[model samples]
Target: QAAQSVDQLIKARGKVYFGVATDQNRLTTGKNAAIIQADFGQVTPENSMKWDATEPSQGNFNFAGADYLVNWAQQNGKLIRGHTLVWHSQLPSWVSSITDKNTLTNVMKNHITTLMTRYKGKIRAWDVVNEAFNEDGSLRQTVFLNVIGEDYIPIAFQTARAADPNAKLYINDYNLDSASYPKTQAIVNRVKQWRAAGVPIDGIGSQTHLSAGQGAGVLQALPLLASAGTPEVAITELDVAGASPTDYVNVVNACLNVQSCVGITVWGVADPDSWRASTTPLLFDGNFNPKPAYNAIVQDLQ
Candidate 1:
């Protein structure tokens, strides 16, 4: 039999979406774009959909770049995971300058409602809140936390739901998959609390950004995330710096073992394109050739 593509292998098991992060430039042209279209089942805008990119000046929204990608995904029969509705970083200065509590809260809701409503049913899922917690399990002191308070998270999810009821909502963060599990547990407790309070939360996204041996036993965090009453769990932004094939295989196998683990999305397509370009973290090398990590993941999937 002919070998299966990664997306094919993932779907063969059941309903799982194998995805990658990409930008408009890569998705529109070049050999890298071709490879992305051929290989993955889903796509996430690397930065084009973020607040700064979409609404840099306040009240004025730009969806041209994001819309191009979304339309491309729809035409090609691929799914799109809208990245980062709310994040502390990459915000326009105008948002950070807001001093009044009620004004800031309204700004937050307006951003969510306008963006989510515009895309409505087009996106499969959204990273409603990103990196809201510290590694020590405390809230990160962003404008949202300082002005709107901790309720910012629930409000984002709630507003997103009202704007687009069908799309799944996720809270994405980094370091959750680290060995100790404190960060992971903190998110679990928060998800459980949200569930108890009747807040609408669909999943938790483990950024799963790992270095060689750093994410050891990261797979075990999946069940713990599921225990929080979240229906979905995903390796939303997976990248391994100086990765070994064994570590790559282990990460894929762990996701397969967890029933609620819905998807695994590599942070970028090729090493050269990675955010941590210095580390060469990804399944494909600079030339777009499959690396050892790619082969290892495909082997395990087979």
Candidate 2:
């Protein structure tokens, strides 16, 4: 029997990749690991690849955590999406305190190049820049924005491009599920600007963290994201707040409807492992048994 493996079904449907987010800790030892090994075709590191985990000190770098994930995913015959290269949060104390543009620019370049160079061919894609736009359709004010300004985005993409030419570069963010929303428009416009400027951005990541009735927004935004400039898009981090299967089915339907949408990564494996555990917003139960949401996705994909 085929067992209705979601990834296999999606592969049979098209080139779409079905994946989940996991880290060194949340990925379990027994049945959970078995499901991860078989059901999904890709994995995104939840925190191991973030800046603080990778580069804690000024120039000192550590790939131990992320390397563990890369090795584990490869052993499972799963492709890996590098979680992020540049983001405002999870910044080390050393990186967050830098006040000068030249200092920050040099640090950003070295951080991107050094990291991407190590995992050059190993990673298929990277969230080169994450959450750079604000809710009101404007650029957010972070250390990068306050010091180096908007061009920092292009610079990050460029550095990522030179480091791993084959890896697709993406800008990942939340609330980009509706073209009507301000945050969504900000991303769309910025991506358009970047494309015109010849930035190496290859995709947009709509971190579809939604509530009970927001799936319609996702349906409306996919083709809009592709038309915005970057042709490839992914539902980077998805977790719905209410009625798992009922709400979850819509997203699967939405992604299936959009040819440019290349992948969908559930934010965590099981309810207990999810960042929003109280919401029970995942495909599996606390005991690692497949939930209604899992079956719903499989049904929709079929």
For each candidate, give its TM-score against the true structure.
Answer: 0.96, 0.97
Cα lDDT of candidate 2 equals 0.85
Global lDDT of each candidate: 0.85, 0.85
Per-residue lDDT of candidate 2, residues 91-132 (tens digit): 998988999999999999999998899888989899999888
Cα error of candidate 1 at position 193, Å: 0.6
Location of the lowest summed lDDT over 10 successive residues in candidate 2: 25-34
Q: What local lDDT does model 2 show for residue 276?
A: 92
Pairs of colliding residues, candidate 1: none
lDDT of 1 by residue, 63-106 (tens): 98888888888888888899888899999999999978899989
RMSD of 2: 1.5
Error of 1 at 18 (Å): 0.6
Question: How far is 277's C-alpha from truth in model 2 (Å)?
Answer: 0.3
Candidate 1, residue 269: lDDT: 87
In angstroms, the error of model 2 at 115 is 1.2
